[PDB]
Amino acid sequence: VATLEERPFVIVEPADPISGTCIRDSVPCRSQPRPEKRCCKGFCIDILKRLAHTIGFSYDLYLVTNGKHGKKIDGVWNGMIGEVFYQRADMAIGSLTINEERSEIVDFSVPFVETGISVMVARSNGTVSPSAFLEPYSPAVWVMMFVMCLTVVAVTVFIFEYLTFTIGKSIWLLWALVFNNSVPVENPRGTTSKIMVLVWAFFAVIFLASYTANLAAFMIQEEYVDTVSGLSDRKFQRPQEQYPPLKFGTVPNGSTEKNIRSNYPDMHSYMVRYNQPRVEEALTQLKAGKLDAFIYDAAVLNYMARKDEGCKLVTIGSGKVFATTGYGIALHKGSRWKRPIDLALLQFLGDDEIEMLERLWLSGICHEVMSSKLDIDNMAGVFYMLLVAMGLSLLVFAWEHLVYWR
């Protein structure tokens, strides 16, 4: 067989100095002299261990060196595909992504883990929704109360006629009670008239008390927000737009680039200058601030977004995956091994053992809002309400220079 090195799936560690061999729960990986016999383990290898037992055969590992994975260079291949294609080995297990360009020259088993292209971005330092006119009971109580005040003010005026206290002056009192106090007013002196004001207050206190408490609810829970909807978003599609352009830099030599270079040619013109040599060194760039986006696999990023950087590193879409495709085991397109191992993989999904391996290695810690010590100026919910209030004031102001003039 042939394998490579990946952080959570197939991991390579140096041998035991004392015994000169591999500790238990490991299999000896040679590292083509062919010196320095190493040790290897992980989630992927434990799959190979069971399949060797159930079917029955003798195997020895072999780590590739000439390249990493497939990339057709003038009609010749390299990496794992570059070796199965040339009869040097039969199977090629590890971190391999099925694609059209590879199923032509080798066959694949039934995929056992879902993957795809997904985006990874650093979390904000704190955010909360604007929520203009923070919803007390949805925009319905706003409509109904307006009629009620006008309805009762006539009722007040009705007892006024039984007694100047015009409508305009009297209505003003009926309203300033709702919005707390400290707006000087003129209460009438009608004894039986003043009683209805007392009941009117009981509407005010309950309404005001209910509102302030309920508003704590929509800003005690929260659900954060999202940024950059997806791959087809305009912030990606036209990088030469205004403002400091974003940085993408997917790692080259794989399906995560071969996909883009056949579907978004204008993407590939600009993404090239921001490449990263490897995976781990990209994340520190992301946390420092050199980059602001990352295009890679789904299983690798989601695991890498839940081990240690899950404190402040997430994936857009709450795990959304684009152009889904699974992993799989290569073969020789005639190796007649396909029929048994295909049954074996579906057998494992039959009972619940793949999950048992899944929760032993690909486990998580993090996943939930912050303190939001901001109350940022981006509220604008009432400031816009302030400015739109100024405009309506001036519109009726022109009646002063028109009615008198006419």
Ligand X SMILES: N[C@@H](CCC(=O)O)C(=O)O
Ligand Y SMILES: CN[C@]1(c2ccccc2Cl)CCCCC1=O
Ligand Z SMILES: *[C@@H]1O[C@H](CO)[C@@H](O[C@@H]2O[C@H](CO)[C@@H](O)[C@H](O)[C@H]2NC(C)=O)[C@H](O)[C@H]1NC(C)=O
Q: Which is nearer to ligand X, 82 or 254 (CB)?
A: 254
Q: What is the widest separation between alpha-carbon atoms in the chain? A: 115
Compute the distance between CA of residue 375 and CA of residue 379 in angstroms, rounded to an integer: 7
Determine if 124 is a binding residue for other proteins (CB under 8 A).
no
Q: Which is nearer to ligand Y, 105 or 215 (CB)?
A: 215
Q: Which is nearer to ligand X, 109 or 255 (CB)?
A: 255
CB of 138 to other proteins, least distance (A): 13
Instruction: Show the site string, 53-92: x = touches other proteins by CB under 8 A, - = not.
Output: ----------------------------------------
Shortest-Cβ-distance residue relative to ligand Y: 209
What are the b/e assignments for 328-356, b being 16+ CB within 10 Å? bbbbbeeeebbeebeebbeebeeeeebee
Determine if 252 is a binding residue for ligand Z (CB under 6 A).
yes
CB of 140 to other proteins, least distance (A): 11
**Is 97 known to sit in a ligand binding site?**
yes
CB of 311 to ligand Z, least distance (A): 28
Among 277, 289, 334, 391, binds ligand Z (CB under 6 A): 277
Cα-based torsion angle of the residue sequence 200, 134, 180, 196 in order, rounded to the nearest 10 degrees = 0
Determine if 255 is a binding residue for ligand X (CB under 6 A).
yes
Compute the distance between CA of residue 84 and CA of residue 90 in angstroms, rounded to an integer: 6
**Is 255 known to sit in a ligand binding site?**
yes
Determine if 184 is a binding residue for other proteins (CB under 8 A).
yes
Q: Tokens at residue 338, please?
A: 């396909």
Determine if 297 is a binding residue for ligand X (CB under 6 A).
yes
Is the CB of residue 139 less than 8 Å from the CB of residue 152?
no
Q: Is the dihedral of CA 95, 100, 105, 111 positive or negative?
A: positive
**Is 351 known to sit in a ligand binding site?**
no
DSSP-based three-state secondary structure for 70: coil
Q: Tokens at residue 389, please?
A: 């209030």
Count the neighbouring beta carbons within 10 Å of the beta carbon of residue 297: 24
Query: Phi and psi for 39 in degrees, rounded to 5?
Result: -120, 145
Determine if 343 is a binding residue for other proteins (CB under 8 A).
yes
The continuous run of DSSP H or E covering 11 comes out as strand 11-13
Q: Tokens at residue 388, please?
A: 């739109």
From residue 119, alpha-carbon distances to 259, 301, 379 in Å are 14, 8, 28
Is the CB of residue 3 less than 8 Å from the CB of residue 29?
yes
Options 29-37, 74-82, 94-102, 276-284: segment touching other proteins (CB under 8 A): 94-102
Q: Which is nearer to ligand X, 41 or 69 (CB)?
A: 69
DSSP-based three-state secondary structure for 157: helix
From residue 235, alpha-carbon distances to 230, 270, 348, 356 in Å are 9, 13, 43, 40
Determine if 279 is a binding residue for ligand Z (CB under 6 A).
no
**Is 102 known to sit in a ligand binding site?**
yes
Among 43, 77, 160, 296, binds ligand X (CB under 6 A): 296
Name the binder of 247 from ligand X, other proteins, ligand Z, none, CB < 5-8 A by kind.
none
Q: Which is nearer to ligand Y, 159 or 219 (CB)?
A: 219
CB of 84 to ligand Z, least distance (A): 19
Name the binding residues for L-glutamate: 95, 97, 102, 255-256, 297
Q: Where along the sequence are the contacts to ligand X (CB under 6 A)?
A: 69, 95, 97, 251, 254-256, 296-297
